[PDB]
Nucleic acid binder design. Structure first.
Ligand SMILES: [Zn+2]
Ligand SMILES: [Zn+2]
Length: 42
DNA sequence: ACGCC
């Protein structure tokens, strides 16, 4: 199971989501980096 | 279980 990193529903990932994507990161939400690069960690 | 309007 998964939760989307866009709309945030369950049973699909951001790729599989209907909706268009968000800018910057998705995890924390900050720009410059993407959620794979993201490493803020509090 | 994951990105590129
Ligand atoms: Zn979604
Ligand atoms: Zn981030």
């Amino acid at each position: 199971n998964v939760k989307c990193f866009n709309c945030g529903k369950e049973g699909h990932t951001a790729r599989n989501c209907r909706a268009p994507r968000k800018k910057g990161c998705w995890k924390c939400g900050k720009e410059g980096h993407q959620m794979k690069d993201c490493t803020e960690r509090q």
